[PDB]
Symmetry: C2
Subunit: 178 residues, 2 copies
Amino acid sequence: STHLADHYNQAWLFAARAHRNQTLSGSPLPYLVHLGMVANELLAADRDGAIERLGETLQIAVLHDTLQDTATSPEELRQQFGEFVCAGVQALSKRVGDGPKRSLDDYLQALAEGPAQYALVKLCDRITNLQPPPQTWNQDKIANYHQESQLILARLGHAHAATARRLREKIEHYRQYY
Amino acid sequence: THLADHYNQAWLFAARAHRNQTLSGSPLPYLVHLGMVANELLAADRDGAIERLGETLQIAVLHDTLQDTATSPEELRQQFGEFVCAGVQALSKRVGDGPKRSLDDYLQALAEGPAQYALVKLCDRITNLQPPPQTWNQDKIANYHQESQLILARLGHAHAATARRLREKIEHYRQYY
Ligand SMILES: [Mn+2]
Ligand SMILES: [Mn+2]
Protein backbone atom coordinates (compact mmCIF):
# COMPACT_ATOMS: atom_id res chain seq x y z
CA SER A 1 0.00 0.00 0.00
CA THR A 2 1.88 2.97 1.45
CA HIS A 3 5.62 3.67 1.17
CA LEU A 4 7.44 4.44 4.48
CA ALA A 5 8.46 7.91 3.08
CA ASP A 6 4.82 8.74 2.19
CA HIS A 7 3.82 7.84 5.86
CA TYR A 8 6.67 10.17 7.02
CA ASN A 9 5.70 13.05 4.71
CA GLN A 10 2.00 13.02 5.74
CA ALA A 11 2.96 13.20 9.48
CA TRP A 12 5.87 15.67 8.83
CA LEU A 13 3.73 18.28 6.95
CA PHE A 14 1.01 17.96 9.65
CA ALA A 15 3.61 18.48 12.49
CA ALA A 16 5.36 21.42 10.66
CA ARG A 17 1.92 23.24 10.58
CA ALA A 18 0.84 22.22 14.11
CA HIS A 19 4.22 23.33 15.71
CA ARG A 20 4.76 26.44 13.47
CA ASN A 21 4.57 28.83 16.50
CA GLN A 22 7.04 26.70 18.60
CA THR A 23 10.89 26.78 19.02
CA LEU A 24 13.40 24.44 20.75
CA SER A 25 13.92 25.37 24.46
CA GLY A 26 16.15 28.52 24.84
CA SER A 27 16.91 28.40 21.05
CA PRO A 28 15.13 30.40 18.28
CA LEU A 29 15.36 27.30 15.95
CA PRO A 30 12.06 25.61 15.02
CA TYR A 31 10.66 22.86 17.27
CA LEU A 32 10.67 20.83 14.02
CA VAL A 33 14.47 20.39 14.70
CA HIS A 34 13.59 18.05 17.68
CA LEU A 35 10.99 16.04 15.72
CA GLY A 36 13.41 15.42 12.83
CA MET A 37 15.93 13.88 15.21
CA VAL A 38 13.32 11.72 17.05
CA ALA A 39 11.93 10.34 13.72
CA ASN A 40 15.45 9.65 12.36
CA GLU A 41 16.32 7.81 15.62
CA LEU A 42 13.23 5.65 15.16
CA LEU A 43 13.91 4.75 11.48
CA ALA A 44 17.61 3.98 12.35
CA ALA A 45 16.39 1.70 15.26
CA ASP A 46 14.58 -0.57 12.69
CA ARG A 47 18.05 -1.42 11.13
CA ASP A 48 19.10 -2.97 14.54
CA GLY A 49 15.77 -4.79 15.19
CA ALA A 50 12.73 -4.79 12.84
CA ILE A 51 9.66 -2.84 14.23
CA GLU A 52 6.05 -4.10 13.64
CA ARG A 53 3.93 -1.29 12.04
CA LEU A 54 7.05 0.74 11.15
CA GLY A 55 5.16 3.32 9.02
CA GLU A 56 2.69 4.27 11.78
CA THR A 57 5.41 4.15 14.51
CA LEU A 58 7.54 6.56 12.40
CA GLN A 59 4.40 8.82 12.19
CA ILE A 60 4.01 8.59 16.03
CA ALA A 61 7.69 9.73 16.37
CA VAL A 62 6.89 12.80 14.19
CA LEU A 63 3.55 13.61 15.95
CA HIS A 64 4.43 12.66 19.59
CA ASP A 65 4.20 16.32 20.87
CA THR A 66 1.06 17.46 18.88
CA LEU A 67 -1.58 16.85 21.61
CA GLN A 68 0.58 18.38 24.40
CA ASP A 69 1.91 21.51 22.61
CA THR A 70 -0.40 22.34 19.61
CA ALA A 71 -4.11 23.08 18.74
CA THR A 72 -4.35 19.37 17.47
CA SER A 73 -7.38 17.28 18.60
CA PRO A 74 -7.33 13.49 19.11
CA GLU A 75 -10.23 13.33 16.54
CA GLU A 76 -7.98 15.03 13.86
CA LEU A 77 -5.19 12.43 14.49
CA ARG A 78 -7.70 9.51 14.48
CA GLN A 79 -9.35 10.75 11.20
CA GLN A 80 -6.08 11.51 9.35
CA PHE A 81 -3.66 8.82 10.74
CA GLY A 82 -5.87 6.09 12.38
CA GLU A 83 -6.43 4.73 15.94
CA PHE A 84 -2.97 3.11 16.48
CA VAL A 85 -1.22 6.50 15.78
CA CYS A 86 -3.80 8.53 17.78
CA ALA A 87 -3.35 6.11 20.82
CA GLY A 88 0.46 6.39 20.32
CA VAL A 89 0.43 10.25 20.57
CA GLN A 90 -2.02 10.01 23.60
CA ALA A 91 0.29 7.42 25.40
CA LEU A 92 3.24 9.82 24.84
CA SER A 93 1.27 12.96 26.05
CA LYS A 94 2.01 13.75 29.76
CA ARG A 95 -0.77 16.38 29.37
CA VAL A 96 -3.28 16.78 26.45
CA GLY A 97 -3.90 20.50 25.82
CA ASP A 98 -5.05 21.97 29.21
CA GLY A 99 -6.39 18.63 30.66
CA PRO A 100 -4.63 17.19 33.80
CA LYS A 101 -0.84 16.43 33.65
CA ARG A 102 -0.07 12.73 34.55
CA SER A 103 2.69 11.79 37.08
CA LEU A 104 5.90 10.21 35.68
CA ASP A 105 5.09 6.86 37.37
CA ASP A 106 1.59 6.76 35.74
CA TYR A 107 3.10 7.95 32.38
CA LEU A 108 5.89 5.32 32.38
CA GLN A 109 3.66 2.48 33.70
CA ALA A 110 1.09 3.03 30.85
CA LEU A 111 3.94 3.08 28.25
CA ALA A 112 5.55 -0.12 29.79
CA GLU A 113 2.24 -2.10 29.67
CA GLY A 114 1.07 -0.67 26.29
CA PRO A 115 2.27 -1.28 22.72
CA ALA A 116 6.12 -1.61 22.73
CA GLN A 117 6.29 0.70 19.66
CA TYR A 118 5.00 3.67 21.83
CA ALA A 119 7.68 2.87 24.50
CA LEU A 120 10.29 2.67 21.72
CA VAL A 121 9.35 6.23 20.49
CA LYS A 122 9.85 7.41 24.09
CA LEU A 123 13.40 5.87 24.14
CA CYS A 124 14.14 7.77 20.82
CA ASP A 125 12.75 10.99 22.43
CA ARG A 126 14.99 10.70 25.56
CA ILE A 127 18.07 9.74 23.38
CA THR A 128 17.40 13.00 21.37
CA ASN A 129 17.02 15.02 24.60
CA LEU A 130 20.46 13.81 25.91
CA GLN A 131 22.28 16.17 23.47
CA PRO A 132 24.37 18.77 25.42
CA PRO A 133 22.14 20.61 27.88
CA PRO A 134 20.90 24.18 27.21
CA GLN A 135 23.53 26.80 28.22
CA THR A 136 21.14 28.25 30.90
CA TRP A 137 20.70 24.98 32.98
CA ASN A 138 22.65 24.80 36.27
CA GLN A 139 24.45 21.64 37.52
CA ASP A 140 21.36 20.66 39.65
CA LYS A 141 18.91 20.80 36.67
CA ILE A 142 21.37 18.69 34.55
CA ALA A 143 21.81 16.13 37.41
CA ASN A 144 18.03 15.78 37.89
CA TYR A 145 17.51 15.30 34.09
CA HIS A 146 20.23 12.59 34.12
CA GLN A 147 18.45 10.72 37.02
CA GLU A 148 15.00 11.01 35.26
CA SER A 149 16.67 9.51 32.09
CA GLN A 150 17.84 6.51 34.20
CA LEU A 151 14.16 5.85 35.24
CA ILE A 152 13.05 6.01 31.56
CA LEU A 153 15.77 3.42 30.74
CA ALA A 154 14.74 1.15 33.69
CA ARG A 155 10.96 1.40 32.93
CA LEU A 156 10.97 1.24 29.07
CA GLY A 157 14.32 -0.33 27.93
CA HIS A 158 12.49 -3.71 27.43
CA ALA A 159 10.82 -2.17 24.28
CA HIS A 160 13.84 -2.52 21.89
CA ALA A 161 17.25 -4.05 22.88
CA ALA A 162 19.46 -2.01 20.54
CA THR A 163 17.72 1.34 21.37
CA ALA A 164 17.99 0.53 25.16
CA ARG A 165 21.78 -0.02 24.59
CA ARG A 166 21.97 3.38 22.78
CA LEU A 167 20.01 5.18 25.57
CA ARG A 168 22.43 3.69 28.24
CA GLU A 169 25.45 5.01 26.22
CA LYS A 170 23.78 8.49 25.92
CA ILE A 171 23.10 8.40 29.73
CA GLU A 172 26.80 7.48 30.44
CA HIS A 173 27.92 10.28 28.00
CA TYR A 174 25.62 12.90 29.66
CA ARG A 175 27.36 12.29 33.04
CA GLN A 176 30.17 14.57 31.72
CA TYR A 177 27.90 17.71 31.90
CA TYR A 178 27.94 17.66 35.79
CA THR B 1 29.75 6.52 14.91
CA HIS B 2 25.97 5.71 14.99
CA LEU B 3 23.87 6.57 11.88
CA ALA B 4 21.65 8.85 14.05
CA ASP B 5 24.75 10.74 15.45
CA HIS B 6 25.82 11.41 11.80
CA TYR B 7 22.23 12.69 11.09
CA ASN B 8 22.18 14.93 14.20
CA GLN B 9 25.59 16.60 13.37
CA ALA B 10 24.41 17.44 9.80
CA TRP B 11 20.80 18.30 10.91
CA LEU B 12 21.88 20.85 13.58
CA PHE B 13 24.44 22.36 11.11
CA ALA B 14 21.67 22.69 8.45
CA ALA B 15 19.04 24.14 10.89
CA ARG B 16 21.58 26.92 11.72
CA ALA B 17 22.74 27.51 8.09
CA HIS B 18 19.09 27.70 6.80
CA ARG B 19 17.78 29.55 9.97
CA ASN B 20 16.34 32.57 8.06
CA GLN B 21 14.98 30.53 5.06
CA THR B 22 11.40 29.34 4.35
CA LEU B 23 9.97 27.08 1.66
CA SER B 24 9.40 29.46 -1.33
CA GLY B 25 6.08 31.35 -0.63
CA SER B 26 5.37 29.51 2.72
CA PRO B 27 5.89 30.58 6.34
CA LEU B 28 7.21 26.99 6.95
CA PRO B 29 10.99 26.61 7.48
CA TYR B 30 13.24 25.27 4.71
CA LEU B 31 14.09 22.49 7.21
CA VAL B 32 10.70 20.88 6.15
CA HIS B 33 12.25 20.01 2.73
CA LEU B 34 15.52 18.65 4.20
CA GLY B 35 13.66 16.36 6.61
CA MET B 36 11.75 14.76 3.71
CA VAL B 37 14.91 14.30 1.54
CA ALA B 38 16.95 12.73 4.41
CA ASN B 39 13.99 10.45 5.32
CA GLU B 40 13.66 9.31 1.61
CA LEU B 41 17.43 8.54 1.64
CA LEU B 42 17.34 6.44 4.88
CA ALA B 43 14.13 4.64 3.61
CA ALA B 44 15.96 3.83 0.30
CA ASP B 45 18.64 1.80 2.21
CA ARG B 46 15.89 -0.71 3.34
CA ASP B 47 15.32 -1.58 -0.41
CA GLY B 48 19.05 -1.87 -1.44
CA ALA B 49 21.91 -1.22 1.05
CA ILE B 50 23.90 2.04 0.37
CA GLU B 51 27.71 2.18 0.91
CA ARG B 52 28.80 5.04 3.27
CA LEU B 53 25.17 5.37 4.49
CA GLY B 54 26.05 7.76 7.35
CA GLU B 55 27.88 10.28 5.13
CA THR B 56 25.18 9.89 2.37
CA LEU B 57 22.44 10.75 4.91
CA GLN B 58 24.49 13.87 5.90
CA ILE B 59 24.76 14.81 2.19
CA ALA B 60 20.95 14.57 1.95
CA VAL B 61 20.59 16.93 4.96
CA LEU B 62 23.31 19.38 3.75
CA HIS B 63 22.63 19.22 -0.05
CA ASP B 64 21.36 22.89 -0.25
CA THR B 65 23.94 24.57 2.15
CA LEU B 66 26.40 25.75 -0.59
CA GLN B 67 23.47 27.07 -2.84
CA ASP B 68 21.36 28.95 -0.24
CA THR B 69 23.50 29.63 2.93
CA ALA B 70 26.69 31.34 4.28
CA THR B 71 28.29 27.82 4.34
CA SER B 72 31.78 27.38 2.71
CA PRO B 73 33.25 24.18 1.24
CA GLU B 74 36.14 24.50 3.76
CA GLU B 75 33.61 24.31 6.71
CA LEU B 76 31.87 21.23 5.18
CA ARG B 77 35.30 19.52 4.51
CA GLN B 78 36.58 20.33 8.08
CA GLN B 79 33.40 19.22 9.93
CA PHE B 80 32.00 16.35 7.69
CA GLY B 81 34.96 15.16 5.51
CA GLU B 82 35.89 15.40 1.75
CA PHE B 83 33.25 12.76 0.68
CA VAL B 84 30.38 14.87 2.19
CA CYS B 85 31.81 18.23 0.90
CA ALA B 86 32.20 16.81 -2.67
CA GLY B 87 28.59 15.41 -2.45
CA VAL B 88 27.19 18.88 -1.54
CA GLN B 89 29.30 20.39 -4.37
CA ALA B 90 28.02 17.78 -6.97
CA LEU B 91 24.38 18.61 -5.95
CA SER B 92 24.87 22.47 -6.07
CA LYS B 93 23.63 23.68 -9.50
CA ARG B 94 24.87 27.18 -8.27
CA VAL B 95 26.68 28.74 -5.29
CA GLY B 96 24.70 31.82 -4.08
CA ASP B 97 23.93 34.46 -6.78
CA GLY B 98 26.53 32.81 -9.08
CA PRO B 99 25.80 31.33 -12.51
CA LYS B 100 23.74 28.04 -12.56
CA ARG B 101 25.39 25.04 -14.25
CA SER B 102 23.33 23.76 -17.23
CA LEU B 103 21.13 20.73 -16.46
CA ASP B 104 23.16 18.62 -18.98
CA ASP B 105 26.45 19.52 -17.15
CA TYR B 106 24.85 19.07 -13.70
CA LEU B 107 23.32 15.62 -14.42
CA GLN B 108 26.34 14.38 -16.43
CA ALA B 109 28.69 15.09 -13.42
CA LEU B 110 26.22 13.35 -11.03
CA ALA B 111 25.92 10.28 -13.39
CA GLU B 112 29.72 9.81 -13.69
CA GLY B 113 30.48 10.55 -10.02
CA PRO B 114 29.79 8.53 -6.84
CA ALA B 115 26.37 6.75 -7.13
CA GLN B 116 25.46 8.01 -3.58
CA TYR B 117 25.31 11.67 -4.78
CA ALA B 118 23.05 10.64 -7.73
CA LEU B 119 20.89 8.70 -5.21
CA VAL B 120 20.40 11.89 -3.08
CA LYS B 121 19.29 13.77 -6.22
CA LEU B 122 16.66 11.06 -6.96
CA CYS B 123 15.45 11.51 -3.28
CA ASP B 124 15.42 15.32 -3.79
CA ARG B 125 13.23 15.07 -7.00
CA ILE B 126 10.91 12.46 -5.29
CA THR B 127 10.37 15.06 -2.49
CA ASN B 128 9.77 17.93 -4.98
CA LEU B 129 6.96 15.89 -6.81
CA GLN B 130 4.44 16.56 -4.07
CA PRO B 131 1.41 18.59 -5.21
CA PRO B 132 2.61 21.81 -6.82
CA PRO B 133 2.17 25.10 -4.92
CA GLN B 134 -1.17 26.91 -5.70
CA THR B 135 0.90 29.64 -7.50
CA TRP B 136 2.44 27.39 -10.25
CA ASN B 137 0.82 27.86 -13.73
CA GLN B 138 0.02 24.92 -16.10
CA ASP B 139 3.27 25.54 -18.16
CA LYS B 140 5.49 25.50 -15.00
CA ILE B 141 3.89 22.18 -13.77
CA ALA B 142 4.29 20.68 -17.32
CA ASN B 143 8.01 21.73 -17.61
CA TYR B 144 8.78 20.45 -14.05
CA HIS B 145 7.21 17.07 -15.04
CA GLN B 146 9.42 16.86 -18.21
CA GLU B 147 12.62 17.96 -16.27
CA SER B 148 11.75 15.09 -13.81
CA GLN B 149 11.74 12.57 -16.75
CA LEU B 150 15.35 13.76 -17.65
CA ILE B 151 16.52 13.24 -14.01
CA LEU B 152 15.13 9.67 -13.99
CA ALA B 153 16.76 8.89 -17.41
CA ARG B 154 20.21 10.41 -16.43
CA LEU B 155 20.44 9.26 -12.73
CA GLY B 156 17.99 6.30 -12.31
CA HIS B 157 20.95 3.86 -12.62
CA ALA B 158 22.07 4.96 -9.08
CA HIS B 159 19.54 2.86 -7.05
CA ALA B 160 16.94 0.50 -8.68
CA ALA B 161 14.26 0.75 -5.90
CA THR B 162 14.52 4.59 -5.74
CA ALA B 163 14.36 4.86 -9.59
CA ARG B 164 11.07 2.77 -9.49
CA ARG B 165 9.79 5.20 -6.82
CA LEU B 166 10.70 8.31 -8.88
CA ARG B 167 8.91 6.77 -11.97
CA GLU B 168 5.77 6.20 -9.85
CA LYS B 169 6.01 9.86 -8.54
CA ILE B 170 6.41 11.15 -12.16
CA GLU B 171 3.33 9.08 -13.30
CA HIS B 172 1.34 10.48 -10.24
CA TYR B 173 2.44 14.12 -11.00
CA ARG B 174 0.93 13.93 -14.54
CA GLN B 175 -2.55 14.45 -12.88
CA TYR B 176 -1.61 18.13 -11.99
CA TYR B 177 -1.63 19.37 -15.69
MN1 LIG C 1 9.93 14.92 22.15
MN1 LIG D 1 16.55 19.95 -2.31
